[PDB]
RNA sequence: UCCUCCUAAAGAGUAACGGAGGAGCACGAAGGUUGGCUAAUCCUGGUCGGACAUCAGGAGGUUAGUGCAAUGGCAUAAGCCAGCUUGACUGCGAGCGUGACGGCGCGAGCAGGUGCGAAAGCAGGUCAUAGUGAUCCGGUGGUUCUGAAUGGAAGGGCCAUC
RNA sequence: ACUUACCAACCCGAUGCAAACUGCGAAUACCGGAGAAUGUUAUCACGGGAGACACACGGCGGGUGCUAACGUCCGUC
RNA sequence: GCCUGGCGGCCGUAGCGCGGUGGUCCCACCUGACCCCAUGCCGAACUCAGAAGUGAAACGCCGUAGCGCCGAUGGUAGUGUGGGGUCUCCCCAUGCGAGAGUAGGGAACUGCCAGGCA
């Protein structure tokens, strides 16, 4: 269970965030995705993935 | 080129008269000449495989393909997806060009007293031998190269049987003996 | 061999169209000619057809087997389908790449007015 | 003693023994010994019966064995409570239906095969009878 | 060694034929986990992510065998 | 505690200190879509190379393969390779299956926005079935719901999450 | 470098066995639809009150046991 | 009337093997490929521009019972209900009735559109 839980934070001013999991030793690079933000109702980038 | 039109005019007539074919198409043709090395020392280091690719490119002209292991055989401690050999399948104008540069000069240099085996057919019409000496073709200098690894060629033909294949290859300059 | 491979390529779409239940424009390409026909949703009856093997179309071109003849046949299919009144057909490539001569015919029909 | 070289499973359900035998014809030899009742038939019994007729004819003719012990039989120790898992295999047995042919012989006279099969039947637990190859 | 430890709740196999549920898409008319011998006949909507067949709107449920390999499909007669 | 098979008597369900095996994960691609491809094994010929590495041809037609135990599936591929991508989206959801209940599961279709494709279309994670822990208590972010004389604040509620 | 009083894979023919084998396959049972007769609604829903959750033996199909037990554990009458 | 191409019905009595045969059209081979497009390398495949030549391969058609395939009647096994026996297994009345095997069959049939030939 070395895989750990991280949260993807919307780049917009909204505080909305998603949650997922990722391996730390294999891919330490930050994860960047494009997901729907229900507050602004648009697809935006997400960050903050250790 | 020259041997392409030489197969076109004459040669084909020789085989036609020999085997009494009803149709011109019944005469066997040549589709491809496959060059293969399969060094196998890639398990030691990748530079040997790179050098092998360069050497085979020297003869071919464009680039070789790298063949991966189809199984993880423990006997040869090979791993699936591990490139252990290189290959080329030239075709058409380049095929005839290499066949010319092979037959004309390289084969006479290959043990003139022996040449190659007369019986080297699989049974359908294919015709293959190992050069074993990559210096014959001289296109590229070999006083600088490091290894003297060999080489293998296989001529594919649409011949029905070994007799037809041998007759076709005899029609060319292939001395067999 | 090649024909079997083409049929293997085309089967999935061929029957996905019948699952959706829609009239399909099927195209058969050969080195010398090209054919197109509109097949009904049940896949048993032909509504419209046109190719380069008929006197018309084929007697007013350079050589059957090029993109110009493909465009002519597409125009013919579009006009005849419009005459019959059928609309909203689903084009199928029948295992051929969409970029070749099959690009035409399809383009010609959709510009003619058939709802690709 | 006869038993399989390897077993896919080491223990098997008890099961029942119903119906008539399938192989009821003399196929390999000229004379045969076929059962009339039903019951178990152990490897030890088969081996002893084989020796009976083999030594009865010494060195003459050929002998076939049609049955084979396939299913294992378990048995728990003496002073053991009920339960605590299934017992452990002790011997192998062959289920035989009435009409099953057990042994056959070819290269011997009838008057000697009869006595050899009599001796073998003496060892066998189930009752048997002597049959001839005949035709279809 | 070791026994018991058997899975539980093997779900279900067959949920009906003909106008048994009928109304709406239903969620039966399938052997879950089966796929083979129970395919969508086009008339009923395709499998779920767990290989579950279901209806479109209404109608009778029928079973047929057709096509190469002699596979069995479930169709629905719209009414 | 959970998953697979038999026992289990051709709908479901069905016990024993009955007979056999696994799980307490993994993947940012091993997901989505478009395009393409087809296995194991054996035989013949050929430098190192041989029982087995790679090459050509011929038999064979899935005995191959699946991220992981077993069953059921898979050629249309659910198996193999490449391009672009984030639908591993948000709010709902007729209808249904399975449970004493708590609950668990499948789901067409609607609204918003998005990816692949020429288009028809597909996509609400992975071939499916294990990879899990109620309530209470508290922590973090958002909210303009409450705020004990009034204005604030503390605390509480609601949404996400530990 | 020949020999073989030796064993033996694959393949072909014949012969058996399997709860965890199936290129086959019933009788029953179950689900759904239509119809006649018969049955004091025998069916379902809601509400008030319960008791009960130690079962026994016989037949049939089984697991376990030694197809032993007035043994033991299931299915159905 | 035939012959050919495309899309279907059906899913081996529809397959495989062996022999023969087809080029007006169609189909496939087939020529070239500076380009559209492409090969983990290769106009092999995909793709483009053509019609000199050949039905050799492939494909269509015809014959052939070597194999695959289908397959009765009868008997047998099993089984629901009722009854019986020496009851671990059977029998009788009645209802249902296999699998395997035998005789035998079998070298598919069929719808729509288009073209060549009357
Ligand atoms: Mg059951
Ligand atoms: Mg039952
Ligand atoms: Mg119960
Ligand atoms: Mg996957
Ligand atoms: Mg695809
Ligand atoms: Mg996938
Ligand atoms: Mg899986
Ligand atoms: Mg206040
Ligand atoms: Mg708060
Ligand atoms: Mg109790
Ligand atoms: Mg009880
Ligand atoms: Mg008791």
């Amino acid at each position: 269970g070395i895989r750990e839980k991280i949260k993807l934070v919307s780049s917009a001013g909204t505080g909305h965030f998603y949650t997922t999991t990722k391996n730390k030793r294999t891919k330490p690079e930050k994860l960047e995705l494009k997901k729907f933000d229900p507050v602004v109702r648009q697809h935006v980038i997400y960050k903050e993935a250790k | 080129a020259k041997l392409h039109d030489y197969y076109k005019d004459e040669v084909v007539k020789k085989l036609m008269t020999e085997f009494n074919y009803n149709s011109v198409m019944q005469v066997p043709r040549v589709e491809k000449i496959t060059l293969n090395m399969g060094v196998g020392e890639a398990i030691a280091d990748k530079k040997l495989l790179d050098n092998a690719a360069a050497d085979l490119a020297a003869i071919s002209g464009q680039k070789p393909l790298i063949t991966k292991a189809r199984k993880s055989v423990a006997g040869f401690k090979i791993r699936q997806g591990y490139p252990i050999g290189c290959k080329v399948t030239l075709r058409g104008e380049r095929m005839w060009e290499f066949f010319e540069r092979l037959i004309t000069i390289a084969v006479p240099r290959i043990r003139d007293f022996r040449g190659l085996s007369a019986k080297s057919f699989d049974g359908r019409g294919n015709y293959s031998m190992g050069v074993r000496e990559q210096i014959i073709f001289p296109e590229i200098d070999y006083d600088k190269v490091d290894r003297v690894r060999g080489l293998d060629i296989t001529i594919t033909t649409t011949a029905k049987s070994d007799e037809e294949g041998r007759a076709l290859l005899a029609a060319f300059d292939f001395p067999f003996r | 061999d090649k024909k079997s491979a083409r049929i293997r390529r085309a089967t999935r779409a061929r029957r996905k169209l019948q699952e959706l239940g829609a009239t399909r424009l099927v195209v058969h390409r050969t080195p010398r000619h090209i054919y197109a026909q509109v097949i009904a949703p049940n896949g048993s009856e032909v509504l419209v057809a046109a190719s380069t093997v008929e006197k018309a179309i084929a007697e007013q071109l350079k050589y059957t087997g090029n993109k110009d003849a493909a465009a002519a046949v597409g125009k013919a299919v579009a006009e005849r389908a419009l005459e019959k009144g059928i609309k909203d057909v689903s084009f199928d490539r029948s295992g051929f790449q969409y970029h070749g001569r099959v690009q035409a015919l399809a383009d010609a029909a959709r510009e003619a007015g058939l709802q690709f | 003693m006869l038993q399989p070289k390897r077993t896919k499973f080491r223990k098997m359900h008890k099961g029942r023994n119903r119906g008539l035998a399938q192989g009821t014809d003399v196929s390999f030899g000229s004379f045969g010994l076929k059962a009339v009742g039903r019951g178990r038939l152990t490897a030890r019994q088969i081996e002893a019966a084989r020796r009976a007729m083999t030594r009865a004819v010494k060195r003459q003719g050929k002998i076939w064995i049609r049955v084979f012990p396939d299913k294992p039989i378990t048995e728990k120790p003496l002073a053991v409570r009920m339960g605590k898992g299934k017992g452990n295999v002790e011997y192998w047995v062959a289920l035989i239906q009435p009409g099953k042919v057990l042994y056959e012989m070819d290269g011997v006279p009838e008057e000697l095969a009869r006595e050899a099969f009599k001796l073998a039947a003496a060892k066998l637990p189930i009752k048997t009878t002597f049959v001839t190859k005949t035709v279809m | 060694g070791g026994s018991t430890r058997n899975g539980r709740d093997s779900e279900a196999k067959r949920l009906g034929v003909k106008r048994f549920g009928g109304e709406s898409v239903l969620a039966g008319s399938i052997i879950v986990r089966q796929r083979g011998t129970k395919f969508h006949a086009g008339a009923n909507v395709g499998c779920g992510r767990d290989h579950t067949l279901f209806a479109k709107a209404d109608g009778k449920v029928k079973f047929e065998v057709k096509g190469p390999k002699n596979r069995k499909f479930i169709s629905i007669e719209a009414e």
Side-chain angles (χ1 to χ4, degrees), chain B residues 1-26:
Chain B
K2 186 268 175 305
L3 312 181
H4 196 5
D5 52 56
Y6 180 39
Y7 180 92
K8 290 187 180 183
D9 78 327
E10 206 247 11
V11 183
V12 152
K13 185 55 55 173
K14 151 96 195 206
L15 278 305
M16 261 281 258
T17 54
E18 166 147 58
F19 291 110
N20 193 268
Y21 289 151
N22 191 331
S23 171
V24 64
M25 305 270 186
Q26 300 175 225

mmCIF file of all heavy atoms in Angstrom, chain B residues 1-26:
data_model
loop_
_atom_site.group_PDB
_atom_site.id
_atom_site.type_symbol
_atom_site.label_atom_id
_atom_site.label_comp_id
_atom_site.label_asym_id
_atom_site.label_seq_id
_atom_site.Cartn_x
_atom_site.Cartn_y
_atom_site.Cartn_z
ATOM 1 N N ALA B 1 18.749 -3.424 -61.901
ATOM 2 C CA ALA B 1 18.508 -2.717 -63.191
ATOM 3 C C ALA B 1 18.929 -3.591 -64.367
ATOM 4 O O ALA B 1 18.081 -4.118 -65.104
ATOM 5 C CB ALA B 1 19.258 -1.392 -63.215
ATOM 6 N N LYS B 2 20.244 -3.747 -64.544
ATOM 7 C CA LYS B 2 20.738 -4.583 -65.632
ATOM 8 C C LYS B 2 20.213 -6.003 -65.493
ATOM 9 O O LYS B 2 19.714 -6.587 -66.457
ATOM 10 C CB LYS B 2 22.267 -4.577 -65.668
ATOM 11 C CG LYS B 2 22.859 -5.319 -66.872
ATOM 12 C CD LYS B 2 23.158 -6.785 -66.568
ATOM 13 C CE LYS B 2 23.633 -7.543 -67.803
ATOM 14 N NZ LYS B 2 22.680 -7.442 -68.947
ATOM 15 N N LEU B 3 20.297 -6.576 -64.290
ATOM 16 C CA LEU B 3 19.778 -7.924 -64.102
ATOM 17 C C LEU B 3 18.255 -7.966 -64.123
ATOM 18 O O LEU B 3 17.689 -8.997 -64.488
ATOM 19 C CB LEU B 3 20.310 -8.533 -62.804
ATOM 20 C CG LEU B 3 21.820 -8.415 -62.577
ATOM 21 C CD1 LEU B 3 22.205 -9.084 -61.269
ATOM 22 C CD2 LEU B 3 22.619 -9.015 -63.727
ATOM 23 N N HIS B 4 17.579 -6.871 -63.772
ATOM 24 C CA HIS B 4 16.126 -6.830 -63.921
ATOM 25 C C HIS B 4 15.730 -6.999 -65.385
ATOM 26 O O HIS B 4 14.967 -7.911 -65.743
ATOM 27 C CB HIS B 4 15.592 -5.510 -63.362
ATOM 28 C CG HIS B 4 14.114 -5.501 -63.122
ATOM 29 N ND1 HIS B 4 13.323 -6.618 -63.279
ATOM 30 C CD2 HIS B 4 13.284 -4.505 -62.732
ATOM 31 C CE1 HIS B 4 12.069 -6.311 -62.997
ATOM 32 N NE2 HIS B 4 12.018 -5.035 -62.662
ATOM 33 N N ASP B 5 16.275 -6.154 -66.262
ATOM 34 C CA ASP B 5 15.956 -6.285 -67.677
ATOM 35 C C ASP B 5 16.584 -7.530 -68.293
ATOM 36 O O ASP B 5 16.103 -8.000 -69.327
ATOM 37 C CB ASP B 5 16.391 -5.035 -68.446
ATOM 38 C CG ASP B 5 17.835 -4.660 -68.193
ATOM 39 O OD1 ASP B 5 18.719 -5.511 -68.425
ATOM 40 O OD2 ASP B 5 18.088 -3.515 -67.761
ATOM 41 N N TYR B 6 17.621 -8.089 -67.663
ATOM 42 C CA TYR B 6 18.201 -9.343 -68.131
ATOM 43 C C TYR B 6 17.283 -10.519 -67.827
ATOM 44 O O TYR B 6 17.186 -11.465 -68.616
ATOM 45 C CB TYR B 6 19.568 -9.540 -67.475
ATOM 46 C CG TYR B 6 20.293 -10.808 -67.857
ATOM 47 C CD1 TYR B 6 20.256 -11.295 -69.156
ATOM 48 C CD2 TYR B 6 21.031 -11.511 -66.915
ATOM 49 C CE1 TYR B 6 20.927 -12.453 -69.502
ATOM 50 C CE2 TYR B 6 21.704 -12.668 -67.250
ATOM 51 C CZ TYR B 6 21.649 -13.135 -68.544
ATOM 52 O OH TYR B 6 22.320 -14.289 -68.880
ATOM 53 N N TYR B 7 16.626 -10.494 -66.667
ATOM 54 C CA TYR B 7 15.574 -11.461 -66.390
ATOM 55 C C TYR B 7 14.422 -11.281 -67.366
ATOM 56 O O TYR B 7 13.837 -12.259 -67.847
ATOM 57 C CB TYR B 7 15.091 -11.309 -64.947
ATOM 58 C CG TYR B 7 13.984 -12.265 -64.561
ATOM 59 C CD1 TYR B 7 14.274 -13.494 -63.985
ATOM 60 C CD2 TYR B 7 12.651 -11.938 -64.769
ATOM 61 C CE1 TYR B 7 13.268 -14.372 -63.630
ATOM 62 C CE2 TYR B 7 11.638 -12.809 -64.417
ATOM 63 C CZ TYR B 7 11.953 -14.023 -63.848
ATOM 64 O OH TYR B 7 10.949 -14.895 -63.495
ATOM 65 N N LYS B 8 14.082 -10.028 -67.673
ATOM 66 C CA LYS B 8 13.010 -9.773 -68.631
ATOM 67 C C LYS B 8 13.331 -10.380 -69.996
ATOM 68 O O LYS B 8 12.611 -11.258 -70.484
ATOM 69 C CB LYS B 8 12.757 -8.269 -68.744
ATOM 70 C CG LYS B 8 12.129 -7.679 -67.492
ATOM 71 C CD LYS B 8 11.726 -6.229 -67.681
ATOM 72 C CE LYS B 8 11.108 -5.670 -66.408
ATOM 73 N NZ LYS B 8 10.626 -4.272 -66.575
ATOM 74 N N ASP B 9 14.413 -9.927 -70.628
ATOM 75 C CA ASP B 9 14.821 -10.468 -71.920
ATOM 76 C C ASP B 9 15.818 -11.603 -71.716
ATOM 77 O O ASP B 9 16.797 -11.458 -70.981
ATOM 78 C CB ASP B 9 15.417 -9.369 -72.805
ATOM 79 C CG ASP B 9 16.849 -9.014 -72.436
ATOM 80 O OD1 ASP B 9 17.205 -9.082 -71.243
ATOM 81 O OD2 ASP B 9 17.624 -8.663 -73.350
ATOM 82 N N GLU B 10 15.564 -12.738 -72.369
ATOM 83 C CA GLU B 10 16.345 -13.946 -72.131
ATOM 84 C C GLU B 10 16.085 -14.434 -70.711
ATOM 85 O O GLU B 10 15.215 -13.893 -70.021
ATOM 86 C CB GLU B 10 17.838 -13.683 -72.360
ATOM 87 C CG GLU B 10 18.647 -14.917 -72.763
ATOM 88 C CD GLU B 10 19.662 -15.348 -71.714
ATOM 89 O OE1 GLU B 10 19.612 -14.837 -70.576
ATOM 90 O OE2 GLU B 10 20.514 -16.203 -72.033
ATOM 91 N N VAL B 11 16.816 -15.455 -70.265
ATOM 92 C CA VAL B 11 16.654 -15.990 -68.916
ATOM 93 C C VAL B 11 15.256 -16.581 -68.784
ATOM 94 O O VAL B 11 15.084 -17.803 -68.680
ATOM 95 C CB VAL B 11 16.899 -14.903 -67.850
ATOM 96 C CG1 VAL B 11 16.789 -15.484 -66.450
ATOM 97 C CG2 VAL B 11 18.257 -14.246 -68.058
ATOM 98 N N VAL B 12 14.247 -15.707 -68.787
ATOM 99 C CA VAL B 12 12.865 -16.166 -68.723
ATOM 100 C C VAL B 12 12.575 -17.114 -69.876
ATOM 101 O O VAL B 12 11.884 -18.125 -69.708
ATOM 102 C CB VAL B 12 11.905 -14.961 -68.718
ATOM 103 C CG1 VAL B 12 10.560 -15.333 -69.328
ATOM 104 C CG2 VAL B 12 11.728 -14.433 -67.302
ATOM 105 N N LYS B 13 13.095 -16.805 -71.066
ATOM 106 C CA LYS B 13 12.921 -17.704 -72.201
ATOM 107 C C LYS B 13 13.617 -19.037 -71.958
ATOM 108 O O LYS B 13 13.095 -20.096 -72.328
ATOM 109 C CB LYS B 13 13.452 -17.047 -73.475
ATOM 110 C CG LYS B 13 13.216 -17.854 -74.749
ATOM 111 C CD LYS B 13 11.744 -18.206 -74.953
ATOM 112 C CE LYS B 13 10.852 -16.973 -74.929
ATOM 113 N NZ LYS B 13 9.445 -17.295 -75.290
ATOM 114 N N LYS B 14 14.805 -19.006 -71.349
ATOM 115 C CA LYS B 14 15.503 -20.245 -71.025
ATOM 116 C C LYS B 14 14.631 -21.135 -70.148
ATOM 117 O O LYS B 14 14.424 -22.316 -70.450
ATOM 118 C CB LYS B 14 16.842 -19.920 -70.346
ATOM 119 C CG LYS B 14 17.390 -20.953 -69.343
ATOM 120 C CD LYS B 14 18.403 -21.887 -69.987
ATOM 121 C CE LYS B 14 18.661 -23.104 -69.112
ATOM 122 N NZ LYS B 14 20.010 -23.693 -69.341
ATOM 123 N N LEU B 15 14.103 -20.578 -69.055
ATOM 124 C CA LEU B 15 13.269 -21.380 -68.162
ATOM 125 C C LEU B 15 11.986 -21.829 -68.853
ATOM 126 O O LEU B 15 11.526 -22.962 -68.649
ATOM 127 C CB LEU B 15 12.944 -20.596 -66.891
ATOM 128 C CG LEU B 15 14.005 -20.572 -65.784
ATOM 129 C CD1 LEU B 15 14.410 -21.981 -65.365
ATOM 130 C CD2 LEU B 15 15.219 -19.772 -66.214
ATOM 131 N N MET B 16 11.386 -20.950 -69.658
ATOM 132 C CA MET B 16 10.165 -21.302 -70.375
ATOM 133 C C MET B 16 10.393 -22.513 -71.267
ATOM 134 O O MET B 16 9.623 -23.478 -71.235
ATOM 135 C CB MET B 16 9.690 -20.109 -71.204
ATOM 136 C CG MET B 16 8.575 -19.301 -70.564
ATOM 137 S SD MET B 16 6.956 -20.072 -70.740
ATOM 138 C CE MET B 16 6.258 -19.089 -72.063
ATOM 139 N N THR B 17 11.457 -22.481 -72.071
ATOM 140 C CA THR B 17 11.750 -23.608 -72.948
ATOM 141 C C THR B 17 12.131 -24.851 -72.154
ATOM 142 O O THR B 17 11.788 -25.968 -72.555
ATOM 143 C CB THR B 17 12.871 -23.243 -73.922
ATOM 144 O OG1 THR B 17 14.007 -22.764 -73.192
ATOM 145 C CG2 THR B 17 12.403 -22.168 -74.893
ATOM 146 N N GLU B 18 12.837 -24.682 -71.034
ATOM 147 C CA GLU B 18 13.259 -25.834 -70.245
ATOM 148 C C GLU B 18 12.059 -26.577 -69.671
ATOM 149 O O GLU B 18 11.935 -27.797 -69.827
ATOM 150 C CB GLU B 18 14.200 -25.382 -69.126
ATOM 151 C CG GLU B 18 14.443 -26.434 -68.055
ATOM 152 C CD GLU B 18 15.840 -26.362 -67.473
ATOM 153 O OE1 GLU B 18 16.212 -25.290 -66.949
ATOM 154 O OE2 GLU B 18 16.566 -27.376 -67.539
ATOM 155 N N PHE B 19 11.159 -25.857 -69.003
ATOM 156 C CA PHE B 19 10.060 -26.493 -68.283
ATOM 157 C C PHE B 19 8.753 -26.527 -69.066
ATOM 158 O O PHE B 19 7.745 -26.996 -68.528
ATOM 159 C CB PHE B 19 9.839 -25.789 -66.940
ATOM 160 C CG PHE B 19 10.949 -26.015 -65.953
ATOM 161 C CD1 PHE B 19 11.807 -24.988 -65.604
ATOM 162 C CD2 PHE B 19 11.132 -27.260 -65.373
ATOM 163 C CE1 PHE B 19 12.828 -25.197 -64.697
ATOM 164 C CE2 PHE B 19 12.151 -27.475 -64.466
ATOM 165 C CZ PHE B 19 12.999 -26.442 -64.127
ATOM 166 N N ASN B 20 8.741 -26.057 -70.311
ATOM 167 C CA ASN B 20 7.568 -26.158 -71.179
ATOM 168 C C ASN B 20 6.323 -25.594 -70.494
ATOM 169 O O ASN B 20 5.248 -26.196 -70.504
ATOM 170 C CB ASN B 20 7.344 -27.607 -71.613
ATOM 171 C CG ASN B 20 6.345 -27.726 -72.747
ATOM 172 O OD1 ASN B 20 5.149 -27.908 -72.520
ATOM 173 N ND2 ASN B 20 6.833 -27.623 -73.977
ATOM 174 N N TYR B 21 6.477 -24.419 -69.890
ATOM 175 C CA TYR B 21 5.356 -23.775 -69.218
ATOM 176 C C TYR B 21 4.338 -23.268 -70.231
ATOM 177 O O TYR B 21 4.694 -22.691 -71.263
ATOM 178 C CB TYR B 21 5.846 -22.612 -68.357
ATOM 179 C CG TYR B 21 6.613 -23.018 -67.118
ATOM 180 C CD1 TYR B 21 7.595 -22.192 -66.592
ATOM 181 C CD2 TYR B 21 6.354 -24.220 -66.472
ATOM 182 C CE1 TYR B 21 8.299 -22.549 -65.464
ATOM 183 C CE2 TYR B 21 7.052 -24.586 -65.343
ATOM 184 C CZ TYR B 21 8.022 -23.747 -64.843
ATOM 185 O OH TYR B 21 8.719 -24.110 -63.720
ATOM 186 N N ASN B 22 3.057 -23.488 -69.927
ATOM 187 C CA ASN B 22 1.995 -22.970 -70.784
ATOM 188 C C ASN B 22 1.913 -21.452 -70.704
ATOM 189 O O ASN B 22 1.726 -20.780 -71.726
ATOM 190 C CB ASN B 22 0.657 -23.598 -70.394
ATOM 191 C CG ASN B 22 -0.440 -23.310 -71.403
ATOM 192 O OD1 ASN B 22 -0.431 -22.277 -72.072
ATOM 193 N ND2 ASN B 22 -1.396 -24.225 -71.512
ATOM 194 N N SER B 23 2.052 -20.895 -69.505
ATOM 195 C CA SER B 23 1.917 -19.465 -69.276
ATOM 196 C C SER B 23 3.248 -18.873 -68.835
ATOM 197 O O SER B 23 4.059 -19.534 -68.180
ATOM 198 C CB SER B 23 0.848 -19.180 -68.215
ATOM 199 O OG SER B 23 0.854 -17.813 -67.840
ATOM 200 N N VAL B 24 3.463 -17.607 -69.202
ATOM 201 C CA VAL B 24 4.680 -16.913 -68.797
ATOM 202 C C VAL B 24 4.763 -16.820 -67.281
ATOM 203 O O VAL B 24 5.854 -16.896 -66.705
ATOM 204 C CB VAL B 24 4.740 -15.517 -69.450
ATOM 205 C CG1 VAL B 24 3.595 -14.643 -68.955
ATOM 206 C CG2 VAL B 24 6.081 -14.854 -69.170
ATOM 207 N N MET B 25 3.620 -16.657 -66.610
ATOM 208 C CA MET B 25 3.617 -16.494 -65.161
ATOM 209 C C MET B 25 4.169 -17.705 -64.429
ATOM 210 O O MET B 25 4.671 -17.558 -63.310
ATOM 211 C CB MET B 25 2.201 -16.213 -64.666
ATOM 212 C CG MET B 25 1.555 -15.037 -65.349
ATOM 213 S SD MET B 25 1.928 -13.535 -64.431
ATOM 214 C CE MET B 25 0.939 -12.346 -65.311
ATOM 215 N N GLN B 26 4.093 -18.890 -65.028
ATOM 216 C CA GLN B 26 4.572 -20.084 -64.347
ATOM 217 C C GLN B 26 6.060 -20.005 -64.039
ATOM 218 O O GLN B 26 6.531 -20.698 -63.130
ATOM 219 C CB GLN B 26 4.272 -21.317 -65.196
ATOM 220 C CG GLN B 26 2.792 -21.514 -65.477
ATOM 221 C CD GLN B 26 2.526 -22.674 -66.413
ATOM 222 O OE1 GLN B 26 1.730 -22.565 -67.346
ATOM 223 N NE2 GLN B 26 3.190 -23.796 -66.165
#
